[PDB]
Amino acid sequence: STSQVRQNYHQDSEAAINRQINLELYASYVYLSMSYYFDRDDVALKNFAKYFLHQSHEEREHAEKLMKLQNQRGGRIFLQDIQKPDEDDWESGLNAMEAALHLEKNVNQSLLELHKLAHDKNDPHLADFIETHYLNEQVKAIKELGDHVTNLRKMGAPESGLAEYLFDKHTLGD
Amino acid sequence: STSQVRQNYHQDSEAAINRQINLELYASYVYLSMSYYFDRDDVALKNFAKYFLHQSHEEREHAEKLMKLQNQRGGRIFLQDIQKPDEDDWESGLNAMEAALHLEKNVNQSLLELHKLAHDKNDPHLADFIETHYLNEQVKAIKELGDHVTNLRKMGAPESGLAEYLFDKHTLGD
Amino acid sequence: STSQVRQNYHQDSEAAINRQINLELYASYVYLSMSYYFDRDDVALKNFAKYFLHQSHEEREHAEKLMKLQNQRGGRIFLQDIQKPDEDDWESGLNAMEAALHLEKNVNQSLLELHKLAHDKNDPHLADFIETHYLNEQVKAIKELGDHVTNLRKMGAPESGLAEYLFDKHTLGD
Amino acid sequence: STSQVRQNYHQDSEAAINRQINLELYASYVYLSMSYYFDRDDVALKNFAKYFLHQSHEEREHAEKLMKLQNQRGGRIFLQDIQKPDEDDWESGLNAMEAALHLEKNVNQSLLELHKLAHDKNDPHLADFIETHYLNEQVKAIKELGDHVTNLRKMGAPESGLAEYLFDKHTLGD
Amino acid sequence: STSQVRQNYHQDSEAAINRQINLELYASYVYLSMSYYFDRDDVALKNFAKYFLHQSHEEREHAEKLMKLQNQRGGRIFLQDIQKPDEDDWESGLNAMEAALHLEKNVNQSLLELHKLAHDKNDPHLADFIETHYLNEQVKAIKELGDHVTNLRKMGAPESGLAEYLFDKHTLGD
Amino acid sequence: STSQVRQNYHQDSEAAINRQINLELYASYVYLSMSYYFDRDDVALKNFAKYFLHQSHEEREHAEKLMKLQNQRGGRIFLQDIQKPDEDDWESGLNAMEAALHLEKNVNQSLLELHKLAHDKNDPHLADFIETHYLNEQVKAIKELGDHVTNLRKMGAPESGLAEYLFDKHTLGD
């Protein structure tokens, strides 16, 4: 039955929100995984570790914000298993940043579709929500991961252990 | 003829804005009536009274900024009578909360139609204005009014005079 | 059913307070209309606009204190339509000052009749309420508007656009 | 191979830790779900929502500290799917508290087994890690949940909606 | 080649940002020119000069944020000559204000066309970027220049040198 | 005809100043281009980017000071097109530094000629202006650009991607 607050909220929108929530939780799990990889005693890049833990916590916020949205519009929250990440070993700082970059473009793609749907269903409140809270966040995150990938490459990563050490100190360590 | 500032601002949009101003002033008036209803010596719920007086002054502000937008775009303000509310006696705390929820959804619907007009006339400025200053304010009012209605019901209102009293104290009073 | 608080409160008085409520709300509306007339890109006198918006919120307070009075004596508030103002275009700073003067003398005339009624019904609390919160406010307001009208006339308004500009800057702007 | 730091760390412990990590993430997920149940417009108990959201974030911390422990001892983290919680709809404040109480005792169960493993493998660093950061935390949580359940039942929950409202305000609302 | 960050960014959009970049710099150049026209000893209106120098620096910021956008989305900046302004002598305060109004309406028109392109290529990030940072800024700037034009005209500009002097003091000089 | 302030100010000097204004605007433009080159996701050297953006805003100040000197002496400002820079793509940190040095030596050459023109025309006011505000600024910039080029070379640039990264961090990052 229909929530007392529901208005102009398409059940397709509601289902897409539930999928986005699962995708943000998944992204935060991937970042959690990347963070404790660089915490390993045989990798030991503390700033990669805390860079990725920070992203892990932001993705958890992203998801909670979609959960609040769902309830605000009178949709109903249906959670699904959070799939484990594709890797347990992320190989290098470089490779981790690249996998993060790919992850973010896939999150961005699902959000752009969410936005298209909201536009298509004449749900301007939801479109504006995706614009305000998610779209520029992806663009900034993707632009930053590219910069990082670019620098690690020009420095000689992953072959230069020096390059990853120094990028950990001078870029990811403030 | 036309204002020196007018640009990409359709006369249909100008008319809808004059319509929305009136509806916002109307909403203010309803909330004013509600507020002083709970100020009656035979109703005597100060925090209900305070809550709707606050929404009354908010709606007045909603109206004033639509008047500002009107002049900004070079449209022209035509005011209309402000219609008296549907009731002089709002019956109870629960009933007033329910009428308020109904009122906001009707205002929300008016705003969503205004937004699709702005997008049909390819007026991205007007569309963003509505997104930015109205759409999420309506979603929040509607979700809050929903929450209040739910709690007042679960508590035993409107039959239970104890329920409305305790809601007035513990939810609407800080 | 007579209110448990009602005492020495005549229904003529009760009815006349409801009329005065409506009249203050009307005065508020007129002032609102004048304010955004001067916000127009082709009128553009910011301190005229500010001045009348201030008067508008004052009149709203005037109306709210009368609704409070009604409930304090155990009368019952009945709201009526709020008529739109007489003009959509107010022509000039001078002309709006003069309509304000005339509006304020009309509200004063109604308040003097309200007070006459309270005294004829031996209602000294009501007469003192009107004396304390309304009569000198009107006299001050009428005196200020006449001062403003007088200076605008001597400066050459409304034919001198220079005059209305300089008045807006030096008298209505701090 | 074998990590340069590994010392007295049995592969059964390492694998028991990996399973605990998953169980803490699971517990986090359950609490997240409970939290936004109470945020629904038709449930609308915001301090229940606040309380479970805070437990959710605490369990994510339990999980991260185990991931740290694993790396400290030279184990290797292997994450698994995080299973979706057993309900989408938690029925009431009282039922949520009872479910949470059941969840915490099960987590307590797995930790005391984790701990008896550590004593048996003569891993005293691991046993005190469990003693110090988990065992008393679980006892406090189980006791607090017991107290809440006890109080909700005496107040008349889950049938008395008044009871859950007042418990939300006077216990969970600080 | 395609940038590693590019996603949902159409080459027409990329091309149109490059044009908008050039147009803002052009606008900044026009304002620079207007500003030092009022610095001339035979014009000598220092608040006119400060007013246009300020808009000049704002327009340069408009251009720089567009260059930032281009790189954020993976586009490539291509700069073009900056055309000199249409006049070397701007004639009067009023005439400069009117040229500024027409300039800002042209930049607005190009910005609306940029936004419609973003909408048509389903590029919600770019459209939101234009909504957020440019469209209301244009509307405010157009509205203000219109106000200034109106006040200069009512005061007797540009024949009244007294008028432009008094307007420079009381409106543009804080 | 002649400005009422003009004195000992040769028409050739007035024209040379108009030329120098353009060249300063040109220098500004080159540095702006360089700046956002290093802001590209595939270049990604923020301190290079910030460094040239700073020089860009300084050149703009250099230009405006000359526009002010022009009016101070009763000459008349004539703006010309600002020519786009010679490159859209500046290749590397070392190459941009070398271009910048070349640009500055060319600007210095223009200024030294402007100075000798001033001394040939017996304009001690113009000659001291160039001395006081440009000549040593040019020498300091040329010396500093020289120092940067030397270090990037000794470090292994532009081959070494590590070189430019470490320089960006330790020299241009304070």
Ligand SMILES: O=C(NO)c1cccc(C(=O)NO)c1
């Ligand atoms: O310490 C123990 N319980 O407290 C314990 C448990 C299992 C085995 C052994 C053992 O091998 N003793 O020799 C000891």
Ligand code: NA
């Ligand atoms: Na928007």
Ligand code: NI
């Ligand atoms: Ni995200």
Ligand code: NI
């Ligand atoms: Ni409203």
Ligand code: NI
């Ligand atoms: Ni209480």
Ligand code: NI
């Ligand atoms: Ni009044």
Ligand code: NI
């Ligand atoms: Ni008498």
Ligand code: NI
């Ligand atoms: Ni735990």
Ligand code: NI
């Ligand atoms: Ni033992």
Ligand code: NI
């Ligand atoms: Ni601009």
Ligand code: NI
């Ligand atoms: Ni569309």
Ligand code: NI
């Ligand atoms: Ni220079």
Ligand code: NI
């Ligand atoms: Ni270093």
